[PDB]
Nucleic acid binder design. Structure first.
Lengths: 130, 144, 120, 122, 26, 14, 72, 31, 189
RNA sequence: UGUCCUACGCCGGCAGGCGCGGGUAACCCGUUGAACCCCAUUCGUGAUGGGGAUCGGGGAUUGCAAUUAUUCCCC
């Protein structure tokens, strides 16, 4: 290979630090709410070569893949893949991302607390659920 | 000019048959091939972006060596080691839709014929095409 | 309040064959299998109790042993006591308990608070 | 006007068919050079490299392979090849050449002619 | 060892018969 | 801090 | 301490691979990785580039090792 | 089934095309 | 002519000691194309002395638990390590192996003689066969231990250990252990 | 081993549904088409792409009953 002058060693995406020297799919896997399968599908829908690093890329690539990874359904990422398929409140198929995953998890725990079910009381004692 | 598919190297023939299938161009590709898995036991998406052509080449060869193969047996070919978690590993068959699509795709190109016996085999034109490609591989092998 | 983006009044008008597009998998499998005689008996009992009640007042409690029962959106506002093997627990049906079984509202066991161990 | 032998290892069995040919050796419908455990290729090519191409002048061998594993199959194949050559030199060639081949094969590796008696135990 | 055994020899004779038949085919 | 209709058998959890 | 190998090339690294590497008798990605702190992937890519250049003989290609020899 | 069981003997290598092949095919128990 | 891996000569190697000349079977009669022979060398006592030394190295490298069935992989490792030996030294790699083995085996060892409780070990001589066995096991264990968590491959550390043991430098784990046992025995006497 | 075991096709990302045949059995499953292992590709010594517990959402079977997840599949 060669030496890229426009190499970014550190990235800050969606309030998350990303190591640029690891490869791009596993680097965007390193954030909360995105795994390797989701990274590989969102990059294969972005028409980006998988062999490049997370610093050896152009910017318009990374904003385009960010726009795809927030909006999966408009980019033909289908309705079995997403984090939350039928949401309890609105029932919209939406993939949920770093901070929002924490907020939705705490929201579900709040819903269980309000409804006073056995699962919620088990979790609030700090025990095993499954 | 007497050469046989059985008497020539295998993985090089897979590569060459996939190259022929790709340069031929005429084949019906499913749309989901950039998001589909390949088995319930395999973990990630395949690294090869043209895995369709290689898999069609492989299933064409299996129909050449052993005719009368159905979808289920061809799924049983492509299965593997299921990592069950902390439970011990097992054997998991491959994806049924991928096998059904590659068999129907090669039936569309008049290389795979449905059998009165029940399964599928190769057409004679597909047999002579495969023999021509095998002769090409032999020519690129014994002279190199 | 909304449930899968559906308001409760539409849920009250939501038809029976098309609530099999709205619940989770287990609930839809149960309602596709259909409810047995005892669950409809509890349904009729709750409907009688809600109907024969003062409007400003909460309806009278209905005691039951049914814990396999799934909460339909018709029941919101009814006041149900459910057995846990030893004692009835009195619970109000809220809007947010449509996707839940009754039995997980009455816990059948007591939490473990460990005492000092004996000779082991 | 031909020879039909076998060679076994555990469960793997190879049946070798030796006849007047032109120096062509193929096994299970494919040549010996392209069989997948090529780290174990020199165990497959054993009588050829011990004897030379001259003793395979007008010899055509076709071997069916069935059963066993992979390594057991390779040992069954090489045993079948050696046994086929020995039986052909018994039946159609003189005695002295055959006993010469038996001497060199027993001197090199005992397994090439007699089978391993040990097999998986109940 | 002087004798093959039942099962292995059954497989061997079936294999030899099949090879003889396929050579008779061509 | 106990709700209206619950029993002690469930009040051990609250 | 932790090992921090450079993920891509440097000018000193490129000078060392273009000059100092093809007289090492043995050339393997592990050794060239360990002498001057290359990742194994980058070392394999550089060694494939040197094969394509023809400066370095290829001896043993295999899945787990590749072994190269300096030219003459 | 039980009567179809065939047992070989292995000595020179067995030639199935030899007319004396029957001498190296057993039908009953040795020993 | 018979060659190891199709290329390695076996008439050129020599055994330096007469003590191990009957126990390292590599020279003329026992040379073979591949180490993988699958022969019964554990059938009776002293039969494994006639087994070729390279097969002994292959067998003592697959010894450990996860690699406990894999011999094809191990003979691949040995092939690559011998290739690296020929690339580095240029000598016939079998002679390098033989020099490593004869230089690595301990010459005397300490033994509990007495009862359970008498911790005074007596220094006794070693069998030449036990010397060869211990040399093989220490070379394989040093190659195993040096390449556990590193970029260096098993075959690479194996070849490097064989070089240090044949050369006699104090970089091999095997020669360090040999010196340790030998000096402990010289302390006991 | 088998009257629930399945051959084949179609509909399915995937677990699964739908139409049809054989087998009360050296016949049909089944030439029992296993995994390690081999060949290449990527990874590169770090709690890492090792390891999978734990939880969060959906889907589908088994059954009178899966709520105190039966089981499996997908993020």
């Amino acid at each position: 290979l060669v030496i890229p002058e426009k190499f970014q060693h550190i990235l800050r995406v969606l309030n998350t630090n990303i190591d640029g020297r690891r490869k791009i799919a596993f680097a965007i896997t390193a954030i909360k709410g995105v795994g390797r399968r989701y990274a590989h599908v969102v990059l294969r829908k972005a028409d980006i070569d998988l062999t490049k690093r997370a610093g050896e890329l152009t910017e318009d690539e990374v904003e385009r893949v960010i726009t795809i990874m927030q909006n999966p359904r408009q980019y033909k990422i289908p309705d079995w893949f997403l984090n939350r398929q039928k949401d309890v409140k609105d029932g919209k198929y939406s993939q949920v991302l770093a901070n929002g995953l924490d907020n939705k998890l705490r929201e579900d725990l709040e819903r269980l607390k309000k409804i006073r079910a056995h699962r919620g009381l088990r979790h609030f004692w700090g025990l095993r659920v499954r | 000019p007497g050469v046989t598919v059985k008497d020539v190297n295998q993985q090089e023939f897979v590569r060459a048959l996939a190259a022929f299938l790709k340069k031929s161009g005429k084949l019906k590709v499913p749309e989901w091939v950039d998001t589909v898995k390949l088995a319930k036991h395999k973990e990630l998406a395949p690294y090869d972006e043209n895995w369709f052509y290689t898999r069609a080449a492989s299933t064409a060869r299996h129909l050449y060596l052993r005719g009368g193969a159905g979808v289920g047996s061809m799924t049983k070919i492509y299965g593997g080691r299921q990592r069950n978690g902390v439970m011990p590993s097992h054997f998991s068959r491959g994806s049924k839709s991928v096998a059904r699509r590659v068999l129907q795709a090669l039936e569309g190109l008049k290389m795979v014929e449905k059998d009165q016996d029940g399964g599928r085999k190769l057409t004679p034109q597909g047999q002579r095409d495969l023999d021509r490609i095998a002769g090409q591989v032999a020519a690129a092998n014994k002279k190199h | 309040f909304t449930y899968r983006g559906v308001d409760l009044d539409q849920l009250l008008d939501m038809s029976y064959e098309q609530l099999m597009q709205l619940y989770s998998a287990r609930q839809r499998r149960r309602l596709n299998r259909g409810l047995r005689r005892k669950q409809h008996s509890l349904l009729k009992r709750l409907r009688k109790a809600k109907k024969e009640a003062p409007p400003m007042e909460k309806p009278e409690v209905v005691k039951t042993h049914l814990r396999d029962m799934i909460i339909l959106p018709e029941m919101v506002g009814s006041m149900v006591g459910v057995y846990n093997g030893k004692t009835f627990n009195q619970v109000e049906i809220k809007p947010e308990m449509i996707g839940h079984y009754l039995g997980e509202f009455s816990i059948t066991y007591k939490p473990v608070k460990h005492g000092r161990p004996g000779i082991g | 006007q031909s020879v039909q032998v076998f060679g076994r290892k555990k469960t793997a069995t190879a049946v070798a068919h030796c006849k007047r040919g032109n120096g062509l050796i193929k096994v299970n419908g494919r040549p010996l050079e392209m069989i997948e455990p090529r780290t174990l290729q020199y165990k497959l090519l054993e009588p050829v490299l011990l004897l030379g191409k001259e003793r395979f002048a007008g010899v055509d061998i076709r071997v069916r392979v069935k059963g066993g594993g992979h390594v057991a199959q390779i040992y069954a194949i090489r045993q079948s090849i050696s046994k086929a050559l020995v039986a052909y030199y018994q039946k159609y060639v003189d005695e002295a050449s055959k006993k010469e081949i038996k001497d060199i094969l027993i001197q090199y590796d005992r397994t090439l002619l007699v089978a391993d008696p040990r097999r998986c135990e109940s | 060892e002087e004798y093959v055994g039942p099962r292995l020899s059954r497989r061997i004779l079936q294999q030899a018969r099949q090879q003889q038949e396929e050579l008779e085919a061509e | 801090k106990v709700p209206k209709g619950t029993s002690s058998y469930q009040a051990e959890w609250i | 301490d932790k090992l921090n190998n450079l993920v891509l090339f440097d000018k000193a690294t490129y000078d060392k691979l273009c000059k100092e590497v093809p007289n090492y008798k043995l050339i393997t990605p592990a050794v060239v990785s360990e002498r001057l702190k290359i990742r194994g992937s980058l070392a394999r890519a550089a060694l494939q580039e040197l094969l394509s250049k023809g400066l370095i003989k290829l001896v043993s290609k295999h899945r787990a090792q590749v072994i190269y020899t300096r030219n003459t | 089934r039980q009567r179809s069981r065939a047992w070989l003997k292995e000595d020179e290598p067995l030639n199935f095309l030899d007319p004396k092949v029957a001498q190296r095919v057993l039908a009953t128990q040795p020993g | 002519d018979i060659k190891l891996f199709g290329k390695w000569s076996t008439d050129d190697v020599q055994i330096n000691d007469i003590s191990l000349q009957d126990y390292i079977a590599v020279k003329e009669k026992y040379a073979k194309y591949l180490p993988h022979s699958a022969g019964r060398y554990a059938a009776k006592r002293f039969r494994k002395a006639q087994c070729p030394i390279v097969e002994r190295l292959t067998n003592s490298m697959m010894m450990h638990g996860r690699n406990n069935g894999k011999k094809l992989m191990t003979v691949r490792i040995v092939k690559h390590a011998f290739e690296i030996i020929h690339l580095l030294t240029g000598e016939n790699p079998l002679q390098v192996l033989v020099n490593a083995i004869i230089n690595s085996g301990p010459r005397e060892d300490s033994t509990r003689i007495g009862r359970a409780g008498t911790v005074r070990r007596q220094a006794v001589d070693v069998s030449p066969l036990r010397r060869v066995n211990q040399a093989i096991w220490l070379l394989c264990t040093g190659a195993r231990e040096a390449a556990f968590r590193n970029i260096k491959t098993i075959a690479e550390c194996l070849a490097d250990e064989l070089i240090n043991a044949a050369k006699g430098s104090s970089n091999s784990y095997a020669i360090k252990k040999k010196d340790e046992l030998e000096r402990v025995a010289k302390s006991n006497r």
